[PDB]
Design a protein around this ligand. Sequence first.
Ligand SMILES: [Ca+2]
Ligand SMILES: [Ca+2]
Ligand SMILES: [Ca+2]
Ligand SMILES: [Ca+2]
Lengths: 405, 145
Amino acid sequence: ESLVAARAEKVANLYRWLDTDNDVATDKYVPVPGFERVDVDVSDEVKQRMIQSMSGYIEHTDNQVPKDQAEALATLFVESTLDYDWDKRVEFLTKLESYGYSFEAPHAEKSIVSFWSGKNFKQYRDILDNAQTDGKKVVYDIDVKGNAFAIDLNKHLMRWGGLFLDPDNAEQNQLKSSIDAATFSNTGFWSSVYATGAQNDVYVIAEGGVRLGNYFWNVELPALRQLQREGLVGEIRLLDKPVSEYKDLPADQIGRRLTDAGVAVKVRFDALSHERQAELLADNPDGYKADTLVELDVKLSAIDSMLRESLPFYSLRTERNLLVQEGEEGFEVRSWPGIDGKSKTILLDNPEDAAQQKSIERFILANFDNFEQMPDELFLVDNKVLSHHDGRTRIIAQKEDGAWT
Amino acid sequence: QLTEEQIAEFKEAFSLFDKDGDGTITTKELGTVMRSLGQNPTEAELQDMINEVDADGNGTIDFPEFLTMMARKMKDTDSEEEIREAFRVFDKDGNGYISAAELRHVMTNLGEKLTDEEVDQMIREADIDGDGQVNYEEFVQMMTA
Ligand SMILES: [Ca+2]
Ligand SMILES: [Ca+2]
Ligand SMILES: [Ca+2]
Ligand SMILES: [Ca+2]
């Protein structure tokens, strides 16, 4: 079987989930998050011009497509793109795969699938190459041939739009707008595709923190998240600091969580509260332009904080990677997301007592780094904490405060 | 500035983290202890705080020192407002109501250790009407409960 169709379906599941509220997915059309769809009916008049140009590109470029298929593939591309056919663009990728275009990271198991939505990508690429001790080499989307060749054809369509429809003509500009949006969602879909190849810990290069609405926010991170709650991806290491502050450091702690406090948030002025954009003329009327990025005094971490308060033992997930959940005779501790068999137990006199949950939550925080460190059975009874692994000990005694052994 | 309820909670939390029973934690455990009490400084704020309290260089923090640094923190921050602000960023037309799908995107992205189910229901009681639109003011006041 093809690998791409494998991740493609993953991607489709993700997209459908995000669509449960908007329910636009017609299961012949799967929507890309944050990419608006723009159908335009210019029949087969224009289509056969387009396909023949694309056909000619493929045929007169040095690439791994056999020239019998030069036009068969050109058809499949412009057709998957303009008609937003989920099935047809999966087939397109599958056809690329079948020619020798891998949609897999190049370096086998040593590949740290990484993502770069940044400006000074040059400097980061190698500070990260350099810090790798394991013999593992970072890879980016540009490093995978299948994705690369897909974007190449997708650019040709784009250019053909600008070069064969000049936008003064009113219906001509409408096809170009369609092309743009159609070719733009290809790059969105293909991005989720690449993200699903993520494994273990991943670096995200994002100088000056997060940008709401960028390919990371929209089609990269939500795939990474799903990968995470299937236990396939570990830490996501965001690098927002200037590349200077990641030297004299191991791969261990280059990058932090976008959830970590003092992570920057920036949004484009384009469609950033258009009427409120005007309101933002006060400091400089011609200070903020459509492409201008506005730093914001909001904290994404405030969202993660809220979560801690709403969800019992949430804070043990983030800082320790422990999913404890309401059990039968006590509490069940698992290694997050609690998908592997293994489980240990936690028992309190009054489990319904929120005060006592915090005592053992703090307790665990202070005592165990991971799930593997915990006794099979842990007890909070009568302001003393007891542990049975293979013998039995008591170690907590709360006479207004916590003393040990 | 600190109440009896708070110093005692801080005391419990602190003493669990002081493992050798001498009444001092280390420099690197500070942020952990604090975050367990619902106060998350930046890496920067947590260096200022650390450089001040560790002027002697012994990397030692008393409970008293701890009591001091936690008093200054909380003086500064408004949790309730800071969340409501964070959700505001996703109101493109103002009006206080962001979409239910948007709210699904926010939470799955900022829900570091959430799960699809946990998300799904969040959205369900996000707003109990059949409209897409969800109140974000309502949402926080619900989670703050
Ligand atoms: Ca000590
Ligand atoms: Ca000291
Ligand atoms: Ca609104
Ligand atoms: Ca509603």
